[PDB]
Amino acid sequence: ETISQAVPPVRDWPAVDLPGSDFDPVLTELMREGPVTRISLPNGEGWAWLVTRHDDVRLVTNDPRFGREAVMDRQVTRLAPHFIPARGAVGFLDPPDHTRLRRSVAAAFTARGVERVRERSRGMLDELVDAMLRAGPPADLTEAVLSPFPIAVICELMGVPATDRHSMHTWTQLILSSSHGAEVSERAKNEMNAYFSDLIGLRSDSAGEDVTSLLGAAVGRDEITLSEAVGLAVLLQIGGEAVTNNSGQMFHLLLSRPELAERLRSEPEIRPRAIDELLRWIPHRNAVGLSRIALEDVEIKGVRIRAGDAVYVSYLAANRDPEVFPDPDRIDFERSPNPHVSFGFGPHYCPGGMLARLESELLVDAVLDRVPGLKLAVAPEDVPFKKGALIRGPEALPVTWAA
Numbered sequence: 001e002t003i004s005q006a007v008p009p010v011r012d013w014p015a016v017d018l019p020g021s022d023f024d025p026v027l028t029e030l031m032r033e034g035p036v037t038r039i040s041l042p043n044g045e046g047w048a049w050l051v052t053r054h055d056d057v058r059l060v061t062n063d064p065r066f067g068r069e070a071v072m073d074r075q076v077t078r079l080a081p082h083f084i085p086a087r088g089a090v091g092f093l094d095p096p097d098h099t100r101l102r103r104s105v106a107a108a109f110t111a112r113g114v115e116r117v118r119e120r121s122r123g124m125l126d127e128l129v130d131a132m133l134r135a136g137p138p139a140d141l142t143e144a145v146l147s148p149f150p151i152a153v154i155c156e157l158m159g160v161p162a163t164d165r166h167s168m169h170t171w172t173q174l175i176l177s178s179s180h181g182a183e184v185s186e187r188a189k190n191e192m193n194a195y196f197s198d199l200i201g202l203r204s205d206s207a208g209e210d211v212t213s214l215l216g217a218a219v220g221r222d223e224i225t226l227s228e229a230v231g232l233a234v235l236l237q238i239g240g241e242a243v244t245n246n247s248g249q250m251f252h253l254l255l256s257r258p259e260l261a262e263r264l265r266s267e268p269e270i271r272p273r274a275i276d277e278l279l280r281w282i283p284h285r286n287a288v289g290l291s292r293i294a295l296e297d298v299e300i301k302g303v304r305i306r307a308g309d310a311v312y313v314s315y316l317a318a319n320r321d322p323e324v325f326p327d328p329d330r331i332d333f334e335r336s337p338n339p340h341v342s343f344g345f346g347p348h349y350c351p352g353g354m355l356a357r358l359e360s361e362l363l364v365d366a367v368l369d370r371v372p373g374l375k376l377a378v379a380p381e382d383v384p385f386k387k388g389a390l391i392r393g394p395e396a397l398p399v400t401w402a403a
């Protein structure tokens with residue numbers, strides 16, 4: 001019985017700033033190589049496994065045999081020189097503890113929960129768009145709207161005072177500053193970890209609808225510890241700005257394809273489905289994020305993952321799975337059920353998914369029908385994207401309209 005292979009060599013995945021929303025050439029390679037591959041990233045050390053197919057990604061992210069808690073142990077190979085989550089944040093918690101932590105704020109993030117901030121956010125967005133309309137056609141449709149809106153929405157939902165929004169943005173970008181943008185990221189994490197400790201403890205020891213009040217209440221009832229509450233609050237706060245990057249890519253795409261743009265401009269009722277397809281397609285991040293450690297031996301597509309080995313999943317790769325999404329690279333606003341995974345999978349799935357969709361829907365409504373014929377001020381290829389980041393997106397989005 002011939003001796004075959006299951007030894008894909010370790011392939012280096014250097015830090016590379018990609019153009020616009022173009023797919024990562026290296027990930028394409030890894031995908032076709034096989035369902036299970038091995039990678040080496042800029043920071044940390046080792047060669048972690050990489051899963052890329054839709055079904056296997058769901059398996060790894062939803063199976064108790066793969067944990068996050070142990071990732072803190074050794075120094076797994078990764079993109080960021082530092083680890084983003086705190087030593088007790090949900091990102092580094094497994095089911096037992098992870099479950100009661102997510103349960104503490106779950107009601108604030110369901111479709112029903114986030115719809116409660118819908119109208120409030122709409123007014124907030126109109127104020128930003130109106131201010132832009134007042135300034136003048138030449139505008140940066142990121143600094144004017146895409147950045148300020150998501151920041152205001154997450155701050156209002158978290159219970160962060162408007163006067164502190166600038167601090168949140170400063171710290172978040174230093175932490176997600178592609179991390180290799182220094183490492184000054186650790187001090188920024190600590191400062192943010194101190195801010196939320198104060199907020200949760202200070203004032204949030206009463207009754208409010210905001211998330212920090214909810215967390216403070218849970219801490220007071222001894223349901224979760226401080227630190228657990230702070231760790232979760234910080235990840236929610238930084239994650240809230242993910243909509244800036246993503247919607248930036250969303251509008252760059254739309255403004256690059258007149259066919260797609262007019263259809264959304266003419267058919268408002270198809271916008272929710274269309275936005276979900278865009279979310280599937282847009283390559284949200286550079287490379288991969290946070291791995292999981294095999295807690296025991298597990299076989300994936302004929303490959304034995306040894307206990308202790310690190311394993312990454314690529315949600316971007318899974319969203320381009322030919323088997324699940326026929327003609328993966330094509331943007332089809334109709335799309336069958338299309339269960340992408342841009343918001344992750346398993347216990348760690350994004351708590352902000354519904355909120356992100358709500359924000360994107362409001363942004364599209366305002367940008368397409370509030371601003372008279374908005375359009376890119378330069379060629380799609382001339383739009384500058386962030387070069388040295390974790391979450392991909394425009395550094396600036398030059399636009400004009402018709403006023």
Ligand code: HEM
Pocket residue numbers: 061090091092102154232235236237239240241242243246279284290315341342343344345347348349350351352353355356
């Ligand atoms: C279109 C915008 C967004 C995208 C594409 C996105 C995507 C993701 C992905 C891929 C993960 C990884 C799941 C894993 O660990 O395997 C994640 C986690 C997370 N996201 Fe988002 N996200 C978005 C917006 C948000 C927003 C607005 C918030 C704040 C409400 C948020 C909060 C979080 C948190 C707290 C986690 C960690 C969950 C955990 O480990 O339990 N996300 N997100």
Ligand SMILES: O=C1C(O)=CC(=O)c2c(O)cc(O)cc21
Pocket residue numbers: 091235239284285288289290291
């Ligand atoms: O763990 C990941 C991860 O592995 C990939 C991500 O994109 C991500 C993210 O966008 C936000 C997060 O809170 C966590 C992650």
Ligand SMILES: O=C1C(O)=CC(=O)c2c(O)cc(O)cc21
Pocket residue numbers: 079080083084085091176235238239285288289290390391
């Ligand atoms: O981009 C990353 C990333 O590269 C690793 C992360 O762990 C992470 C995270 O825990 C939360 C985030 O919002 C983003 C990230």
